[PDB]
Amino acid sequence: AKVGFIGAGKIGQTIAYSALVSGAVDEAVIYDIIPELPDKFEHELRHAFATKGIKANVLGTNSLDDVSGMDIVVISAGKPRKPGMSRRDLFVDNAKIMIDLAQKLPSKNPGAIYLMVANPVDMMASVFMKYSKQFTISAGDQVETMRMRSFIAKKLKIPVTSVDGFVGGEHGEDAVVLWSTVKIKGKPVDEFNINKDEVSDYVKKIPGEIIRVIGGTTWGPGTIIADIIKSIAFSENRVMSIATPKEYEKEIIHVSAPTVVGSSIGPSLESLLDEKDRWHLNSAMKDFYEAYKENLKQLEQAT
Amino acid sequence: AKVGFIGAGKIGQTIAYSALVSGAVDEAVIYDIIPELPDKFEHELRHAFATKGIKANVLGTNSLDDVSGMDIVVISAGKPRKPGMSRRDLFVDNAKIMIDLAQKLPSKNPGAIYLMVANPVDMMASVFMKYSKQFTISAGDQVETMRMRSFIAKKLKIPVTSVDGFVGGEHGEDAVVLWSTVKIKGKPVDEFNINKDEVSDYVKKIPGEIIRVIGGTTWGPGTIIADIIKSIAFSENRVMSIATPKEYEKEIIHVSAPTVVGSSIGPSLESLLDEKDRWHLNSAMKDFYEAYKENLKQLEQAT
Amino acid sequence: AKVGFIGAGKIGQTIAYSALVSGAVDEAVIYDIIPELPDKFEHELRHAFATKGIKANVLGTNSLDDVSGMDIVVISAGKPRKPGMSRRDLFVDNAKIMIDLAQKLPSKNPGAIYLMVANPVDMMASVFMKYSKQFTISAGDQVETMRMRSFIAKKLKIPVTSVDGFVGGEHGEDAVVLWSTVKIKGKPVDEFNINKDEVSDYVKKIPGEIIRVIGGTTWGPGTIIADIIKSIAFSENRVMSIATPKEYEKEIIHVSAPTVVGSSIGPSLESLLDEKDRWHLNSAMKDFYEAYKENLKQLEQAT
Amino acid sequence: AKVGFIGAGKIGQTIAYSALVSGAVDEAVIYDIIPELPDKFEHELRHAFATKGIKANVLGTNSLDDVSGMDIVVISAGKPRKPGMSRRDLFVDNAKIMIDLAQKLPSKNPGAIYLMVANPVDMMASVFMKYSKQFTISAGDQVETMRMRSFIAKKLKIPVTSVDGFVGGEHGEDAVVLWSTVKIKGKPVDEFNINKDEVSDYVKKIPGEIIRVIGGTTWGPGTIIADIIKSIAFSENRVMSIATPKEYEKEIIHVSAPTVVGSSIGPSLESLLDEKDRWHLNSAMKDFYEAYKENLKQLEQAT
Ligand SMILES: NC(=O)c1ccc[n+]([C@@H]2O[C@H](COP(=O)([O-])OP(=O)(O)OC[C@H]3O[C@@H](n4cnc5c(N)ncnc54)[C@H](O)[C@@H]3O)[C@@H](O)[C@H]2O)c1
Ligand SMILES: NC(=O)c1ccc[n+]([C@@H]2O[C@H](COP(=O)([O-])OP(=O)(O)OC[C@H]3O[C@@H](n4cnc5c(N)ncnc54)[C@H](O)[C@@H]3O)[C@@H](O)[C@H]2O)c1
Ligand SMILES: NC(=O)c1ccc[n+]([C@@H]2O[C@H](COP(=O)([O-])OP(=O)(O)OC[C@H]3O[C@@H](n4cnc5c(N)ncnc54)[C@H](O)[C@@H]3O)[C@@H](O)[C@H]2O)c1
Ligand SMILES: NC(=O)c1ccc[n+]([C@@H]2O[C@H](COP(=O)([O-])OP(=O)(O)OC[C@H]3O[C@@H](n4cnc5c(N)ncnc54)[C@H](O)[C@@H]3O)[C@@H](O)[C@H]2O)c1
């Protein structure tokens, strides 16, 4: 696929690098508002490519117009979290970015899939889609999903490959582990020595903890989001707990649920969850819709 | 994963080779009735591994008791089709193989996923599961699925990665394209100039044509079935049109539908298809049922 | 790289499949004299590609004029060995193939690297280069090299990645282990309990044993030769004991020594071997020379 | 291989991640003096591994004693460059680190290969080896080597895979392009529209420029150094322009030259360079020896 990267900070570089070395990206165009940053990143990539024999076309640029004719456009441009902040605290800052980008990108990338990475991720995806009128998805709870699998595997001292399942609903701190999907070698997680609250808590806290020590999350979400790109680019049909757009009281919202990710996106698999999980996903919709409306008014308090 | 390969003929060797070089198999045990065959294949694999730096343990054996402790057991032991034959002609001869394997493998590989390759594939899976009571899947129409995708791509002169969709129902000559799933860059196949009947006919005829010219199918189903193994081994959650066990009229039958394939298998997604494709999948259940009951009688009439 | 495959039998198909799934081949054109064979192999490859997201162009053809513009041309067209035969028995029959290919391929593929696989491999490379004057290499003793490594590893019950070293000189039954290059975790092989003669004998006999049981060698040399292709295609600079053209007594001959393989081929490293291994490589030149002159006379005595 | 990482800053993380995802590292132990940093990096890795199905054992730790029984030990612990500094300016700061590590690591990792990454790289490798008495190599001019190939490919608008060759001698700013190795599709670089001084200059300046804009080099040298790890771990025998130890006036020094990198290291290929290149490598030895002796005295001016 041809993939545009809007944002070449820590997470944008990690995602682009990981997606490029995985072989899923035939051509990439990497943009950033910071002078020379994308350009120097391009050189980094070429140097890396030489050792691997990678021939992917890469352009690092400060010119937004170079992001044209892409299949997928990955948006990580935004303020990141500082210790002590919630993700939703960023709404007003980063929504202005999305509003601006929504004016500019569409005419150059008609029919592209837009992949939101910038936080608060689900909200950003809704804002971007509202303004751009372009099909937009959010990395959503796919990162949470993998964090959950890896914690459970570490806890039982089993390979992560023995664990299956997803995290879903609202993003981050408000996500829910979808326990009816969670299986260990095919068996319900109940059959195991697993404290469900300890799993949820690790998932919600570990990014905050990475931020406090390292300064931001990189390798994990970078790899994970790149795999979303790869599933689209190779048409692999991986079920991923991304957030796809839904209509709710005539407003576009984004909420996560296991979703088939291929050259085409969908369907989402919420209808196949157990009752409790389906109730949590309905709930997540109502809560998201309420918090997002509030946030839109508070932004409308521009003047 | 630890993977058992039962049957080391053309397709068995291809699946094993491809699953091993893909990185999805940590240990493999390969069995065949043919004296020394498994041994010499093992030496072939070792030679290949040396150039790749692959360290997977591999044992080729003529003693079936050496296949123990597997996570996945792949069965390709059986007589293949000859130009002229139908897949289902093989039922009696190959059912006898499955009944015997079902009395030997499970005690050594309890709780393994059993992946049926030998034809008639779906019926063999049903027999094996009947005589073993171990969880058994069939390659099903996943091969057809890929043939369909590839045909549409070469026809429209587009990358295969632009095409999404599945083939399902009964296996082989009785399969149906699930047209409500076939999309080109997200758009319904009707918006393109492809003749649905030409697609079907290609899918149905190409294996018979390859069998006529080359003598048997290898690289295609081998790679495609190795990817089923990989999706289980790495818990990738790819939607694949494999055939999983379904309770119908109190019998266990196998029919293909798009199904989540990870360390855990399922759910199948037939409830998300359109009315027409759900009708077709319901008829396939009925038809498979009637034909399997008939075939079972034929088997009794041998023994 | 753009890669031409001349001969789509057992080994040709294996090399091509393995080189294509490794990512080293951007475009491939596969030729065989057998009507429809290349075509049906192409369809096999396309089916495999769909599951992997591989977009390499591939053309199977019965018209040799379709092989043009290649960077590398791989020749496996020829009669194979039967239980009992020696590799060199094939000289006359296969030399006739090479003389013809040499009058047809170069005009269409000027400046390509020609990689000889058909046996007797080294002698075929010398003939092809004689009649084509195009730069021609032979798989040489790279296959032997890997067999030797793998044997030592299984013997000492160590990972194959712990073993380094090469097999060189004449090909096959006349090859010699270059013992000054064989190291286990950096240490000379003498410090371990391996019998040098048992290693040699294994290396010499295993292909004949595989040919006896299975009918021909495939996965091992196929993977190993595909890695020669990859090392050229990605300019990896792997030292491989291939046979490159050497001017001796004003003839061009082919003998194996560890050689740098990248987008450019060479140098060969025989001047860095110990006295004994340099002696052996000098005798192989003399012996190959005398035997090739004899074989050329035999060819004249056919035509 | 089992690989220890001493240092989990920007370059240590990039190298470890790249080496891990490439599949060359079976077990890694990552240490850093910064509290909690390695630990949080380990979590990042596990999260990334979950999406890929990677089962490599990883331990991120603040306890140096955990770095035991490794095959390879990769040392990136040290002060990095700030704009305006040369690499050799760091000698006195980072040599103290190496002296300390030389007391501590050996008894826990007997017979390991130590891979120096921290600057001034060649000097650091000599210091570490002097004090530890352990076999030590330096990433050397391998990074420069790839930078050169990629620049030339960009300049001629050809794939980097068409370019072959190496940079060698002293490190960084004092490196020399070894023009007799440099080939484009097999042809001498003279046959091409290439300004040699412009190539050298780009190579020497581009890291300084990345540092000024981004803050440090990451992806390129990370990938490149990881490929050195991979060549050792898979015993691939890639020729790489690393710096291996040589004796000079009874002192151990490190200088770069194309070197065969496998489970065993060596031989270096300086003897096969043209005259001019060989003279530059002799020269580099004399100059290195002089600057390193000076630096050792200036450090001995501890008191
Ligand atoms: N799982 C996830 O979804 C996930 C993971 C990691 C980070 N993030 C989020 O991604 C965003 C970026 O994080 P980061 O660590 O890379 O931050 P960072 O500060 O390293 O980078 C942000 C980048 O965005 C750029 N930027 C800001 N405004 C821009 C504009 N108008 N146009 C173009 N570029 C612009 C900056 O120049 C900078 O290079 C943050 O919102 C962070 O919270 C999300
Ligand atoms: N897409 C698919 O599902 C697919 C693709 C290719 C082949 N097949 C089927 O796979 C089967 C094998 O095809 P093939 O081309 O490899 O045939 P083959 O003759 O090359 O190999 C069959 C192997 O099974 C062995 N065998 C027979 N009975 C056995 C037993 N009781 N235990 C162990 N091994 C036994 C034979 O010894 C032989 O080595 C056939 O039924 C064929 O129709 C299915
Ligand atoms: N390590 C090695 O170097 C190695 C390994 C395996 C096989 N081989 C050699 O490779 C050759 C092929 O072995 P195989 O097992 O694939 O034999 P095979 O009979 O399976 O295949 C040979 C193919 O070459 C074709 N052929 C014959 N003449 C031709 C021509 N003029 N143009 C195009 N195609 C032509 C045949 O039609 C057939 O499809 C043999 O000489 C064998 O000894 C070498
Ligand atoms: N091609 C190359 O060889 C290459 C490429 C990039 C960077 N580097 C060099 O590598 C070194 C590290 O660079 P970076 O960008 O990762 O710097 P950085 O500041 O991001 O990280 C340096 C790390 O070393 C750690 N450290 C310092 N002293 C230590 C000790 N005594 N024990 C353990 N850990 C210690 C720090 O805690 C820090 O995390 C520098 O010398 C830099 O110049 C070399």
Coil, strand, or helix at residue D225?
A: helix
Contact D67, D29 (CB under 8 A): yes
Contact D130, D211 (CB under 8 A): no
DSSP D58: E
Alpha helices in A70-218 (DSSP H): 91-104, 121-132, 142-155, 196-214
Tokens of B18: 């491809």
Return phi, psi of residue D267, to 5°. Answer: -85, 165
Interface of A with C in 220-249 (CB under 8 A): 233-236
Record: contact D267-C269, CB cut-off 8 A:
yes
The alpha carbon of residue D56 and the mean position of all alpha carbons in its chain are separated, in whole angstroms, by: 23
Chain C residue nearest residue D270, CA to CA: C272
D7 marked ligand binding residue = yes
Contact C183, D264 (CB under 8 A): yes
D280 is catalytic: no
Nearest-angstrom CA–CA distance, D253 and D129: 9
Return phi, psi of residue D226, to 5°. Answer: -60, -35
B6 marked ligand binding residue = no
Q: How far is the CA of B12 from the centre of ligand 2 (A)?
A: 7
Q: Which residues line ligand 4 (CB under 6 A)?
A: D 6-12, 32-34, 37, 76-81, 90, 94, 97, 117-119, 121, 139, 143, 216-217, 221
Nearest-angstrom CA–CA distance, A82 and A89: 10
Length of chain D: 303
Nearest-angstrom CA–CA distance, D149 and D199: 9
Handedness of CA A164, A169, A171, A176 (dihedral sign): negative
D69 Ramachandran zone, left/alpha/beta (phi>0; psi -120 to 50)? left
Nearest-angstrom CA–CA distance, B269 and D87: 59
Contact D19, D45 (CB under 8 A): no
Give the Cα-Cα-Cα angle C35, C37, C41 (nearest 5 degrees). Answer: 155
Q: How far is B55 from chain D (nearest CA, A)?
A: 9
B87 marked ligand binding residue = yes
Chain B residue nearest residue D52, CA to CA: B234
Q: How far is D209 from chain A (nearest CA, A)?
A: 8
Kindly report the protein residue whose alpha carbon is nearest to atom 22 of ligand 2.
B9
The Cα diameter of chain B in Å comes to 55
Residue of D234, A2, B35 lying closest to C146 (CA atoms): D234
Handedness of CA A127, A132, A135, A139 (dihedral sign): negative
* Core vs surface per residue B217-254: b (16+ CB within 10 A) or e: bbbbbbbbbbbbbbbbbbbbbbbbbbbbbbebeeebbb
Pick from D72, D137, D239 the residue to mutate for testing the C interface (most C CBs within 10 Å): D239
What are residue D256's DSSP bridge partners?
A: D169, D243
CB-based contact, B48 to chain D, within 8 Å: no
Pick from A55, A71, A227 the residue to mutate for testing the C interface (most C CBs within 10 Å): A55
Length of chain C: 303
Record: contact B269-A265, CB cut-off 8 A:
no
Length of chain B: 303
Handedness of CA C123, C124, C127, C129 (dihedral sign): negative
Tokens of C92: 């006359």
Question: Chain A partners of C233 at a C-beta cutoff of 8 Å?
Answer: 53
Placement of tokens 């909690």 in the chain: D36
Residue of B178, B185, B186, B212 lying closest to B282 (CA atoms): B178
Ligand nearest to the CA of B214: 3
DSSP A248: E
User: Which among D53, D55, D233 has CB closest to B236?
Assistant: D53
Beta sheet of D259-261, edge-to-edge order: C265-268, C259-261, C238-240, D238-240, D259-261, D265-268
What are residue D183's DSSP bridge partners?
A: D164, D188
Q: Which residues contact D302 (CB under 8 A, 6 or more apart)?
A: none
User: Which among D18, D47, D220 has CB closest to A47?
Assistant: D220
For residue C218, the tally of other CB atoms under 10 A from its CB is 23
Contact D277, D181 (CB under 8 A): yes
Tokens of A66: 């170079």
Q: How far is A248 from chain D (nearest CA, A)?
A: 31
State yes or no: cis peptide before A38, omega within 30 of 0.
no
End-to-end CA distance of chain D: 42
Give the Cα-Cα-Cα angle A222, D161, C233 (nearest 5 degrees). Answer: 100
Q: How many CB pairs under 8 A join B and D?
A: 16
Q: Which residues contact B246 (CB under 8 A, 6 or more apart)?
A: B252, B253, B254, B255, B268, B285
Kindly report the protein residue whose alpha carbon is nearest to atom 23 of ligand 4.
D9
Beta sheet of D57-61, edge-to-edge order: D57-61, D27-31, D2-6, D72-75, D113-116, D136-138, D243-248, D251-256, D167-169, D175-177
Contact C250, C161 (CB under 8 A): no
B94 marked ligand binding residue = yes
CB-based contact, A186 to chain B, within 8 Å: yes
Nearest-angstrom CA–CA distance, A283 and A302: 30
Tokens of D136: 């030590």
Record: contact C219-B44, CB cut-off 8 A:
yes
Within chain C, strands assigned E span 2-6, 27-31, 57-61, 72-75, 113-116, 136-138, 163-169, 175-184, 187-188, 238-240, 243-248, 251-256, 259-261, 265-268
H or E element that contains A238 = strand A238-240
What are residue A2's DSSP bridge partners?
A: A27
Cβ-count burial of C274 within 10 angstroms (0-12 exposed, 13-18 middle, 19+ buried)? Answer: exposed
Kindly report the protein residue whose alpha carbon is nearest to atom 42 of ligand 3.
C80
Tokens of D170: 């002293």
Q: How many CB pairs under 8 A join C and D?
A: 85
Return phi, psi of residue D208, to 5°. Answer: -55, -40
Within chain B, strands assigned E span 2-6, 27-31, 57-61, 72-75, 113-116, 136-138, 163-169, 175-184, 187-188, 238-240, 243-248, 251-256, 259-261, 265-268
Residue of D61, D100, D274, D283 lying closest to D188 (CA atoms): D274
Question: Chain A partners of C236 at a C-beta cutoff of 8 Å?
Answer: 53
User: Which among A1, A164, A236 has CB closest to B264?
Assistant: A164
What are residue B168's DSSP bridge partners?
A: B176
Query: What residue segments make up the domains of chain A, in order of their start?
Result: 1-140, 141-295
CA torsion C42-C43-C45-C47 (nearest 10°) is 170
The alpha carbon of residue D244 and the mean position of all alpha carbons in its chain are separated, in whole angstroms, by: 11
Query: What is the dotted CATH code of the domain comprising D1-140?
Result: 3.40.50.720
Cα distances (Å, whole numbers) of residue D112 to A272, D97, D225, D256: 53, 19, 17, 21
What are residue D28's DSSP bridge partners?
A: D3, D58
Tokens of C303: 């035509």
Q: C281 CB less than 6 Å from ligand 3? A: no
Nearest-angstrom CA–CA distance, D198 and C190: 50
Q: B222 CB less than 6 Å from ligand 2? A: no
Kindly report the protein residue whose alpha carbon is nearest to atom 19 of ligand 3.
C9
Placement of tokens 């000076």 in the chain: D294
The DSSP result for C5-67, as a single string, is EE--SHHHHHHHHHHHHTT--SEEEEE-SSTTHHHHHHHHHHHHHHHHT---EEEEES-GGG-
Kindly report the protein residue whose alpha carbon is nearest to atom 13 of ligand 4.
D80
- This structure's resolution (Å) is 1.9
Q: Which residues contact A286 (CB under 8 A, 6 or more apart)?
A: none
Binding residues of C for NAD(+): 7-12, 32, 78-79, 94, 117-119
Nearest-angstrom CA–CA distance, B66 and B78: 20
